[PDB]
Amino acid sequence: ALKDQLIVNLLKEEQVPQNKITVVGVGAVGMACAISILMKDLADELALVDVIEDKLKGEMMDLQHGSLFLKTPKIVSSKDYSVTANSKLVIITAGARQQEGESRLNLVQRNVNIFKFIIPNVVKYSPQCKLLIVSNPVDILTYVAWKISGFPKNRVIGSGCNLDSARFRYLMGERLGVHPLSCHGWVLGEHGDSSVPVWSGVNVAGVSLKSLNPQLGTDADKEQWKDVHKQVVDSAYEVIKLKGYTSWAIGLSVADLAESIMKNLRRVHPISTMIKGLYGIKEDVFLSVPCILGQNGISDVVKVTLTPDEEARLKKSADTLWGIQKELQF
Amino acid sequence: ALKDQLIVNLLKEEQVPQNKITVVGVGAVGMACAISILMKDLADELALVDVIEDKLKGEMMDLQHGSLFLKTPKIVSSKDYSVTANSKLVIITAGARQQEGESRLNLVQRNVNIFKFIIPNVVKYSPQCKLLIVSNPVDILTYVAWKISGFPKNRVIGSGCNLDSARFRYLMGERLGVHPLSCHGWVLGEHGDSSVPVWSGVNVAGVSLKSLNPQLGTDADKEQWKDVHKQVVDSAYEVIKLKGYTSWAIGLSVADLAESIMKNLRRVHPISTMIKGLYGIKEDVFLSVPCILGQNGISDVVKVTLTPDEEARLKKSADTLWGIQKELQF
Amino acid sequence: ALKDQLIVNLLKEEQVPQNKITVVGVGAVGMACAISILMKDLADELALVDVIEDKLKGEMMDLQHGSLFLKTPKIVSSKDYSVTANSKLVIITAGARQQEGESRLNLVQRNVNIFKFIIPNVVKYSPQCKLLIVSNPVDILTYVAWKISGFPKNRVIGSGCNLDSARFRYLMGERLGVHPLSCHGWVLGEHGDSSVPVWSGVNVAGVSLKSLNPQLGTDADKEQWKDVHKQVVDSAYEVIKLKGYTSWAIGLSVADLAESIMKNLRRVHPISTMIKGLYGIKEDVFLSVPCILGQNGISDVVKVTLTPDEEARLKKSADTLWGIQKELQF
Amino acid sequence: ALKDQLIVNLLKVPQNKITVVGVGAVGMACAISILMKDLADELALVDVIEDKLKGEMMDLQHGSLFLKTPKIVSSKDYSVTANSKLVIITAGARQQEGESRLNLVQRNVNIFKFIIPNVVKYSPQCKLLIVSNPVDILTYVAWKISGFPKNRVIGSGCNLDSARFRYLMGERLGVHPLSCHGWVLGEHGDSSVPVWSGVNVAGVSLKSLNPQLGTDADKEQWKDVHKQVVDSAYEVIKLKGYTSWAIGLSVADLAESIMKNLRRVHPISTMIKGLYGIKEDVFLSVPCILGQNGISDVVKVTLTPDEEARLKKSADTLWGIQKELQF
Ligand SMILES: COc1ccc(CC(C(=O)O)C(=O)O)cc1OC
Ligand SMILES: COc1ccc(CC(C(=O)O)C(=O)O)cc1OC
Ligand SMILES: COc1ccc(CC(C(=O)O)C(=O)O)cc1OC
Numbered sequence A, B, C: 001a002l003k004d005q006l007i008v009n010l011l012k013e014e015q016v017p018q019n020k021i022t023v024v025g026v027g028a029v030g031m032a033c034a035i036s037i038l039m040k041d042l043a044d045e046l047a048l049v050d051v052i053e054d055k056l057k058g059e060m061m062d063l064q065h066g067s068l069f070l071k072t073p074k075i076v077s078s079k080d081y082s083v084t085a086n087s088k089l090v091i092i093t094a095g096a097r098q099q100e101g102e103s104r105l106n107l108v109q110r111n112v113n114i115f116k117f118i119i120p121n122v123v124k125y126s127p128q129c130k131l132l133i134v135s136n137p138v139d140i141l142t143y144v145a146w147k148i149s150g151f152p153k154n155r156v157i158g159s160g161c162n163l164d165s166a167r168f169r170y171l172m173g174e175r176l177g178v179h180p181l182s183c184h185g186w187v188l189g190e191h192g193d194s195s196v197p198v199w200s201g202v203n204v205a206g207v208s209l210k211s212l213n214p215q216l217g218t219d220a221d222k223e224q225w226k227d228v229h230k231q232v233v234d235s236a237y238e239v240i241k242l243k244g245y246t247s248w249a250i251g252l253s254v255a256d257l258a259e260s261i262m263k264n265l266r267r268v269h270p271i272s273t274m275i276k277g278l279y280g281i282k283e284d285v286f287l288s289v290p291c292i293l294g295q296n297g298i299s300d301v302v303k304v305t306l307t308p309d310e311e312a313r314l315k316k317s318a319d320t321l322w323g324i325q326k327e328l329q330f
Numbered sequence D: 001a002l003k004d005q006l007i008v009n010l011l012k013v014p015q016n017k018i019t020v021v022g023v024g025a026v027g028m029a030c031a032i033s034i035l036m037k038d039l040a041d042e043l044a045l046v047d048v049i050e051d052k053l054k055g056e057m058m059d060l061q062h063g064s065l066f067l068k069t070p071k072i073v074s075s076k077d078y079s080v081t082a083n084s085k086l087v088i089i090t091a092g093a094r095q096q097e098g099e100s101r102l103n104l105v106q107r108n109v110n111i112f113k114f115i116i117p118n119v120v121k122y123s124p125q126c127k128l129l130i131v132s133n134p135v136d137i138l139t140y141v142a143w144k145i146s147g148f149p150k151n152r153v154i155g156s157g158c159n160l161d162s163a164r165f166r167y168l169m170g171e172r173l174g175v176h177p178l179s180c181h182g183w184v185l186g187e188h189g190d191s192s193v194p195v196w197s198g199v200n201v202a203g204v205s206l207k208s209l210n211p212q213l214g215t216d217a218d219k220e221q222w223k224d225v226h227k228q229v230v231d232s233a234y235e236v237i238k239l240k241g242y243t244s245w246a247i248g249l250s251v252a253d254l255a256e257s258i259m260k261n262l263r264r265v266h267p268i269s270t271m272i273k274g275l276y277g278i279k280e281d282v283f284l285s286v287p288c289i290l291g292q293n294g295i296s297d298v299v300k301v302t303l304t305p306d307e308e309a310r311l312k313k314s315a316d317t318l319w320g321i322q323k324e325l326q327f
């Protein structure tokens, strides 16, 4: 054959990938995650898994055709979870998503039932992986994925409020004329309607905005910074109303988390984890607090010092999640 | 105001961006171009333009929400082309897109009409820009943009066979077990069924595949390497059939061209340009040849030495194209 | 000619660089700046200037030889400043450096003499440039560069405490087991012995470490965090003692600042600027405060809220610097 | 403790670790290039001068905010190199002004007798990337001392020579080196072989446009481009005392292919017995497919009778030198 005329093989090709990533779900979110991960050079192998055969193969092919411009030498796909074997990171984006006017919390029954199939198949073929849950409601589904998988909780991470916080920082930067990277602010709790803007931590260069404007974030605020958090709460719905779904921002947020995990960076992100034992929470609620994220997932949790109102709001968010979570069967 | 309590302003700045890129059309291809350009840090401003107000705004907001994870500090959009002012590079992806089974040539009058609106407005707000045409049929539409714009030919560029050649190199790499970066081969002429694979230039490490197999690419070829070119030609149709459109590979391909232009790299790409004076072409025909691409667009063309067959294909591939443009309604 | 047989020139047009950076001085610091800038793809042209012709040509050549692995297509050098023409950023690293036991402030009369030649020659050819001063004492020398050039203050920047704060954050990171990216804290004032750690701003995820231990940074601190600031102050001298000079950290710090400028990011950095008007400083003192940095240099200054002790230490640094400024002879 | 007031700990070993042996200019250029390409989750430095080594490590560590490599470590003790995927050897005598690289061989063989077993002890499954000169001989020596299979012992070889050739070609043609193709093979030194037959832009053979290409009869004396390739290190040594930046970038390129399993083709030094007519345990540069298991495959270039004689000449030296070494 021409190959053997051109190339003498010197080594029997027993290839196993060292930095493999799998994306489960090839909808808009799953593919935004995939392109973002490919463009950040995080993986030596990318696997895609979903249940619509043609769509799956099409997306795989489309990515493959860009290989010249990438540094991820193997892209593969299958309905069959065997294709995901040996992953270091598996990103779960499959399941129903909310219609306009529908809460993420309304997806729980559908997505728990889908997780009962997906999670055991993932763990079967990728015993060393971290699980990164993106599907909604992400906080509850991280709990569900954790219980189903048999993984210790450090290895099951919800994309959580990493996106809400990035949205908050974008909006804040726009108001201040400063890059989001230098505008610090944390949105914690549910990735959803009950998220908590932590005004007391909002700062540029370590200067607290609340110390300059004590009314910051209340209705008494002349500049109505509370509308920043409302915009954050509403952003999924506003973008769904305009383009039908959201994809790019969540894709970049997931890639950001994947980078911290794959590169063992130990950066702090607001992501879904067990918060039992903090702020008086007694049940296995998962929600976003600032977490140290590295090669073994979430190794540490930062204990944010919240105002009485912030803490009340965070407890109220835990309560809302528990209200849905305690009724689940799986 | 809180901003003024926090920040003392030194000057009212000259706000003209220095590395602005505009993407016209926020369909799947336009957005894939957008996200790829964002992830390659090519621009200090990205502007989006299209005619569907909500979709446009939705896409802009979604990109904006990822700003924390990017290094492109201003992302803007409008149906009004004034938002595109001072672009170094304007990428046109707007217009009708190819349905399943539909040929690119079938898009030609619809898109020539769309270009009568688009191109003058682009030229109005960025008279010094380079135009990068992606919409199909890309060869004919690059000609149309050139005639309408009044720009010198160096600044009107078609994405042409850049992706086709990328696909060839991927498929070649899959056959040889080599990364496509190290697999070389050129697909030239019309971006479509009449493209030409230049068998003589197909090589790895300067070793010509044709010298190892003199029947390479011909019907007597035992490994039927011509099927690699058939796959190249059929790729977009196969992918459209599977997922409804193509996006990722063309997006990456365009970002690669954007990179050469914006960073003045003077890499050689097979892209659509005015080849009158070459291969016995005496009309104002645009098609892909290897072009040196930098900050003034296409400054130079590589003269590929074609076999008599390869060159006959090209002068035909030409007339296939020039038949149509001779009689265009604009 | 072979070039003419292979390539048809289609365009005579004068290449004028769009993103040029000049590095003045090709000692260890200058070359660390150059390689870092090259590896961050910040420039379409790099110019080097120094006074020793062989060393200059050798360094230029060595960088040139790595061009295949870079995306900066023109690397040039000369002892003549005409080579620097049309730079957007000019980085000044030439001058004497301190010995062990010697203060950076002892370099002032030598480096003012050098600056009286270098500065007028730099500004002559680059009307759009920002001047980024790295040579020591950097704060004083930014004042000198500003006086000699007659540039407005936004355009004359000293690398200042960008490195000192990077070191602070590294050492804080080490203590806390968190990446320095997530460890926030500001060292302001002189890049030297009189620098000021802003304990009140030191935080992770918005949580003030001083709020948790109000003794943080004082002599009553059980954990002696003041030693972290002492390590920052002593870092150049410790490294000089071990390897003879410092290069890598300052090179990365300068490239960080070049990135904000070249990409108009508007990130906040602790860099040397004119602080007359702030903290009741009444003289044209330059020193590090958090500055918003972009394509027009420093457009805005963050007014950090300092404790009375922190403010007194910053005024003390300002006094020290003013005292040396009063020794300057133009 | 402040840390505990701030952080609740829940969990109490690197996956992509690279070691650079030698913190001379070459080693540190490799180190900075590897750091700026985000190739490693841990970088270890090893050398014999303890102060210089600590100073370099610290200087790198202070830039950590600006990097994505979260652990940088150093020691004279090779235990610091444990769990390396890739170990890059840059230590030894360096080429001196006006002297062949072959003048370093005995001294660097001696150094390798100490270095290589220590590397092998702590990372028995690493890929070894030899950079020290003369790189072809020392890659052979590393292979013999380590006992590794030949795929995992790689010499930087002519990777930079070919990068220089493409730079020079590019300057002549007004084209980026990424688009100018051409291979320098054989010994990394004065007897390297420019393969004129493969020199091309966009698949267009330069020889086809100028049949005399690379010969004495060449009107444009393209052989001078190879002469400049051969002379490059000597000229830069003359001017600045050593070379560092281009080699660091070349090494980081090879590290990239290995660490990311790219299977790109590089002209690097490999055990070429059986291939290209050679019968002894000799290493020299040919185009190799490079990935996570080192060199898995070699491209067979159709060489002219000359290119083949030279490569047998360029070759024959090395075995004569290697037969006389003992370890
Ligand atoms: C699995 O589907 C999704 C998961 C998360 C998002 C992100 C989205 C959300 O959480 O609804 C957002 O906040 O933009 C979008 C999805 O589908 C479009
Ligand atoms: C704007 O529409 C398109 C332009 C180019 C491509 C790329 C396509 C082609 O050029 O036919 C391909 O090769 O995938 C696809 C488009 O719509 C999906
Ligand atoms: C131009 O000389 C220098 C400027 C700054 C530094 C940085 C250095 C210092 O300020 O002494 C440091 O803090 O590491 C080092 C230089 O020469 C080695």
Ligand SMILES: COc1ccc(CC(C(=O)O)C(=O)O)cc1OC
Pocket: D025, D026, D090, D091, D092, D093, D094, D095, D101, D131, D132, D133, D160, D188, D232, D233, D242, D243, D244, D246, D247
């Ligand atoms: C460790 O010694 C070296 C190894 C390679 C180079 C690179 C050099 C060469 O290979 O001769 C070159 O080509 O620049 C330089 C060295 O010392 C400075």
